[PDB]
Design a protein around this ligand. Sequence first.
Ligand SMILES: C[S@@+](CC[C@H](N)C(=O)[O-])C[C@H]1O[C@@H](n2cnc3c(N)ncnc32)[C@H](O)[C@@H]1O
Ligand SMILES: C[S@@+](CC[C@H](N)C(=O)[O-])C[C@H]1O[C@@H](n2cnc3c(N)ncnc32)[C@H](O)[C@@H]1O
Ligand SMILES: C[S@@+](CC[C@H](N)C(=O)[O-])C[C@H]1O[C@@H](n2cnc3c(N)ncnc32)[C@H](O)[C@@H]1O
Ligand SMILES: C[S@@+](CC[C@H](N)C(=O)[O-])C[C@H]1O[C@@H](n2cnc3c(N)ncnc32)[C@H](O)[C@@H]1O
Ligand SMILES: [K+]
Ligand SMILES: [K+]
Ligand SMILES: [K+]
Ligand SMILES: [K+]
Ligand SMILES: [Mg+2]
Ligand SMILES: [Mg+2]
Ligand SMILES: [Mg+2]
Ligand SMILES: [Mg+2]
Ligand SMILES: [Mg+2]
Ligand SMILES: [Mg+2]
Ligand SMILES: [Mg+2]
Ligand SMILES: [Mg+2]
Lengths: 380, 380, 380, 380
Amino acid sequence: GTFLFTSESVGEGHPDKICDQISDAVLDAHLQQDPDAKVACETVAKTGMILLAGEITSRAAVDYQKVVREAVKHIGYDDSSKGFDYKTCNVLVALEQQSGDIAQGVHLDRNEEDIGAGDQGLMFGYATDETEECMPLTIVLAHKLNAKLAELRRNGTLPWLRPDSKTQVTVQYMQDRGAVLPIRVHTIVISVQHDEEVCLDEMRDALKEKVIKAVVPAKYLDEDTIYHLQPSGRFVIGGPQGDAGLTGRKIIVDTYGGWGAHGGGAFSGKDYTKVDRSAAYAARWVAKSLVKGGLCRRVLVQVSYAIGVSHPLSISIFHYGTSQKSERELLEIVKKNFDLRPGVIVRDLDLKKPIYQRTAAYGHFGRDSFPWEVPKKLKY
Amino acid sequence: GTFLFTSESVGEGHPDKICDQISDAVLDAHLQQDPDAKVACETVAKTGMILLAGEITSRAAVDYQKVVREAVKHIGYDDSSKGFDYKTCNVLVALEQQSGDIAQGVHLDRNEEDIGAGDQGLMFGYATDETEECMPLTIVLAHKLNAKLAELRRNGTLPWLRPDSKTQVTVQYMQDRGAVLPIRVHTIVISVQHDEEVCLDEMRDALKEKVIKAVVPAKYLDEDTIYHLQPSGRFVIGGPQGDAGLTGRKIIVDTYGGWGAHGGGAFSGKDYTKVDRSAAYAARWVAKSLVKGGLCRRVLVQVSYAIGVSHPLSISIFHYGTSQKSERELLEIVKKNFDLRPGVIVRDLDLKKPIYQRTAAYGHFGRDSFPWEVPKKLKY
Amino acid sequence: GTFLFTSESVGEGHPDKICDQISDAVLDAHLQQDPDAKVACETVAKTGMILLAGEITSRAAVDYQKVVREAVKHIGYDDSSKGFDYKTCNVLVALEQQSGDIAQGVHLDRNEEDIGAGDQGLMFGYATDETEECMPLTIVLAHKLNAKLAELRRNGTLPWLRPDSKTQVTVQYMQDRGAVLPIRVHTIVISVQHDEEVCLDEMRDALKEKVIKAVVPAKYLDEDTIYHLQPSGRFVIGGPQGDAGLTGRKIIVDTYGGWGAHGGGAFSGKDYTKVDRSAAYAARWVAKSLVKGGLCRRVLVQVSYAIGVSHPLSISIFHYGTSQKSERELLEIVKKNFDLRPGVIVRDLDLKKPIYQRTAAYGHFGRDSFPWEVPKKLKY
Amino acid sequence: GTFLFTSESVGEGHPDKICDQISDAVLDAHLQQDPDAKVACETVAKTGMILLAGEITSRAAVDYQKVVREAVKHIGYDDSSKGFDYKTCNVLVALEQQSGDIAQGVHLDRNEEDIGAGDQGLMFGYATDETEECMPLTIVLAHKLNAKLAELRRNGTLPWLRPDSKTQVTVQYMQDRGAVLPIRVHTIVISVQHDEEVCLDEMRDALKEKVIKAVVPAKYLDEDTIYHLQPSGRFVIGGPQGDAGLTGRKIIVDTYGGWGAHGGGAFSGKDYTKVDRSAAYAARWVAKSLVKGGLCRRVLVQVSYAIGVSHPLSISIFHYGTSQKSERELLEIVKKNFDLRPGVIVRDLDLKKPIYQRTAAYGHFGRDSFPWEVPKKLKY
Ligand SMILES: C[S@@+](CC[C@H](N)C(=O)[O-])C[C@H]1O[C@@H](n2cnc3c(N)ncnc32)[C@H](O)[C@@H]1O
Ligand SMILES: C[S@@+](CC[C@H](N)C(=O)[O-])C[C@H]1O[C@@H](n2cnc3c(N)ncnc32)[C@H](O)[C@@H]1O
Ligand SMILES: C[S@@+](CC[C@H](N)C(=O)[O-])C[C@H]1O[C@@H](n2cnc3c(N)ncnc32)[C@H](O)[C@@H]1O
Ligand SMILES: C[S@@+](CC[C@H](N)C(=O)[O-])C[C@H]1O[C@@H](n2cnc3c(N)ncnc32)[C@H](O)[C@@H]1O
Ligand SMILES: [K+]
Ligand SMILES: [K+]
Ligand SMILES: [K+]
Ligand SMILES: [K+]
Ligand SMILES: [Mg+2]
Ligand SMILES: [Mg+2]
Ligand SMILES: [Mg+2]
Ligand SMILES: [Mg+2]
Ligand SMILES: [Mg+2]
Ligand SMILES: [Mg+2]
Ligand SMILES: [Mg+2]
Ligand SMILES: [Mg+2]
């Protein structure tokens, strides 16, 4: 009757996640001055180095040096003894205009409504009634565990916690008629960067007690639950200095933690015309609607695009057999109710607002507000 | 009865794929001198720039300058008028040792057999009987279409084709008792970098005729099949100069094109102890076996790991209802037949051999040899 | 009676000189929008790479990417087969604000007239009546020889000449009562980058005939004059790809070719408040005046500064015994006639005008216009 | 009767000087394993960044990461609150082989004795009997003042002193029959990086009392001597973070502080075949000999070279009228006694020994040992 399922998350100071956060700092910063900015900024993190590579065409004036350093300040990386510091690190800027070849194909000369896609791609959307957030529990708890760490780090409670971390959660489920029901937490993993001077025992206790027991409902915990708390033993070297960091390299953490499917596309660093972002948020929007709106417990939604073309080439809706209504019918309800041309998406989900930096840690989905988490009512 | 499903691939000269190929050039190059090398090399591509960021502990002496430039030579990027050239570009090397903190947690002091994982993570494996390769058709054809382009570029037939390209394939399927049957190709997309001097008409004809009709079985093509051939119109600016490139940013192209699931982990740049690679190939190995070995038409396999721990924390097998035998039974057959500790995987799949550069374009799966595509016989 | 004396120059495509030219491109570009810009931009050239490191506080908006690439376009480096190309190279921008610590010390809150120096330093000025330009012949001819190469390269006459070159000139002098008289050219050296396909003989002939005989008065040439024309034999690999390039590493080429003295300070990349530039041009201005104005045949002038202090700490005038009037008297004539506070210099020599890129090749002295080559009339 | 003359020096933590020191760290490191290494390594320093650009052909295996970081560790830059730290900064390595075009011209196929020059150039040598070191006092004292700072910083006495500093010394001389006699110190300048928490008054006192009075003979100080001690007021931001740093940009500090002449060539980063170094040390060697050996009080010596040619194209000896013997005669004594072909120089001055890092701060001349400071006895 039961199966296991694992998902991971990572903290704000994880080297990949830094880049993701920096690339959206850079995005917000343009959108703050030029709503119709075209942004494809990739960040790379390594010891002492933040580098920005990509394409930007904008009217905004932007101090990348300020934008990056504040981003790294907000993360907590603010002293050499933490293995990284916004004050004294290097920032390289290798940023150009958008390819004029791309410029003409995507966005020159057409109503903002009938804008062609920014690239080709495939994007997925998912939602499940296993949780309030309409997300898998495995990923929801993974995020919350890194969230709690951050809370405890910045409030003082564990001033030995450093910014870099990774959680991983495995849950024992059961199959209820195509839908899934979480039953117990089988294994939690936490590895978090720390100050030299604390011992291992002290950390593991604190993670079991202050983090996990605070975060996981005790109904999902029991005497058989395995804990792997600082499994390595030592994690004083962290962030960029431990491990090179790249934008778009935590795109399963950003979405559904192995559940449903992924199209390949990264989110951070990209304005609305990048359909890797706009369509992906739309597809979430749609899936969450279909569940909340009563048609299914669990749903998967594909879309695909061609560069230069506005409508999608394909739309697919898989409901796992959790729906009375057919597969051609949900397709028709989605079609009645959504306009998945990237230029109409942006109106509905307000995607010119510089709110992207909030998205670049703890998931782009299942989260407090954001426009795409707010389900539309369905007419059918 | 039918649903659509899209998948993309990209050529050898796609800026991401360059990095993936360069990161495995760097990996092979170490493994050629030091079989037990520890390698985490990330490449970044942008106009005139290749950069290497990461961690390497090895006894090998390596001329990164040679290793990269030959990699870029083999790709075809060998003149300024192509938008990139191995002779005259910049190569930056920001490479350090592996974190000693990681070193002690993973691999110091233990039989190579009982080596702990290199990191935490989740990894998926998939196989489907819809094709000979045991892969989805959508992704198989996407790869072949970029493959044909490369053939035609390097043999002279279309000496206007440049290295950068992207294909995308959408197939109309039908559900046969949990399994899937491809029926028709609904939409093909191809966008490929070209010389200034050729016109659009000439290219589109050549793609329809020389590439698609050569690659797609005519049984999957008809008068309703949509073609989007150079949808942008112009693609003279390509490779790194068009678009920044990062290692590990085509990890859905590298695997199953939206089918099954993905754990988040990138492949290129990593030796065997990186379970993002070793377990992922093992999970493919297992899924392909279960199908070829007669137990299922379509199967998905999760595994997860903890950094420092050798055994996996979880193993999951989903067969889509295409199997007579239960879900606890396939689990037991896999367990009887495989040892998913990363240090035993490496023996069975021969993963110290410097064959990784071959993997970094056209998929890591469904491909000619490679040890993980060769199914093990099952005892049960 | 006679002594030898050598001086070198280098072309517009010499890797150091590229940087010097790029750093003044960046300077002019600010001064074009913000006359009171504060600029300390260092450029570094190597294969495929231009990098900008330094400090800039300005109101100007500047596309460094455009500014650099055009600079490299104007040089001639515009194809991969020339070993460097403005289109496809990498440009890294590591540029910050000016240190606020420096900002307060130098320039916040004081009449632009009584501005303190930008740094400490020593600067020299020299002039000699051996030539019309009031410069040493050795250096004048070195420059002209690289100048002729450039003329012949850009007009077609020798389309095998590439941008990188170096000349070197040695002249046999005689001592006339403290002053110097050029007598013969003892040795000329020329090494210039070329296309693969031309032979050595052809080049050497062309250099002897088209360059040297065009440039050197035949009165200074004879049958004993040594020529070293492509002394290496082969110079196909040139510019940044041959040799790393740094701003401020041809500061003896920029000035007097070993004659007189140098204070250590580089010129390119710096606005007026950098006294390494402003005082050095002033000291030239003064020396040229004293000679043209009849008081000496040959003169050397030191000045020094303290960071934050406006007046100079010292002024020295050495006339080589070529002056009727004493050493305390020339000091007094200079003092009567010049105001060497950097903020008064800038008014007199018009040093906010974006004319600096013209200075960054072929010398900052002995040249057509520029304000500092135009001697002031002296009252005494 | 009297004239003023200024000279500057800078500390071990001055951003230029860092690069110079790093480039010789890299040189020594090769010479330690491969005596006949060919090295042209340029370093660039800026906030968080050390970059190495250049050409190296060697059999040595070198961990540039270790070599640089230790170099920066030895300097004192070892915490974020000092504005730079060897632990956490970025090190970029853009290092290639030597141009094969240069390789064939300079050093393939010829007795190590009759090796051609590594490049063209002009180099100067100087010596003066005004001091024991046979150097100008202005520069000797400038160096000692930065030397004392370093002593006091590393021993604890002023643990507020940071690595970055600059001194400047002006001395009132008199002309004794072509030679020079120091009379008084007219102006001393010191600006040194400090901790936030010390006040200005405290520093200025300490510099007057602990540094200057310790370093300058009281015979050269009096009540008229001007002091400019922290002239800016504030210097908390220092090293690379204050000011970009380049190798070879303190080449007047490295030599004679404005006295004599300079050929343009930098020293650090270069093995013996780079005549910018080998000939310059030889010319010092020669000048010091002529003075110590009794033929002159003050002497200047030019040499020049052609790339590929072993003998020098020119040799010049100016003795300022401080010698009984003529100008053609000293030429003949030098010629009798020295072999200025770069491959014979290296034997005599032992220039394959990895002692270069000691040279890269406080001057390459007037210093304790080094082979070129040890005068040869003259036969004449
Ligand atoms: C369109 S780009 C990514 C968008 C990019 N970030 C930008 O600047 O907007 C994605 C890939 O599509 C391909 N591509 C680039 N230029 C293209 C063009 N003009 N038309 C079609 N495809 C293009 C390249 O292979 C490129 O790496
Ligand atoms: C282990 S690293 C990736 C492996 C890396 N490429 C290497 O050098 O082997 C992945 C992430 O795990 C976390 N991590 C780093 N060091 C760790 C340690 N010593 N123990 C546990 N987790 C660590 C960091 O957040 C890091 O980004
Ligand atoms: C003043 S800086 C060069 C000017 C710089 N290019 C700028 O941004 O204006 C030259 C050197 O003086 C020293 N220096 C830096 N900041 C200083 C300050 N606030 N006061 C005095 N000296 C300083 C440092 O050693 C620095 O390398
Ligand atoms: C010889 S290089 C400097 C030596 C260099 N650091 C090395 O790798 O040995 C100095 C300059 O001479 C010129 N040059 C480069 N290659 C040359 C060659 N093969 N023959 C003559 N001159 C050359 C270039 O302009 C170059 O910038
Ligand atoms: K990584
Ligand atoms: K990209
Ligand atoms: K150089
Ligand atoms: K500087
Ligand atoms: Mg990563
Ligand atoms: Mg994409
Ligand atoms: Mg990419
Ligand atoms: Mg991973
Ligand atoms: Mg140079
Ligand atoms: Mg200076
Ligand atoms: Mg400098
Ligand atoms: Mg030189």
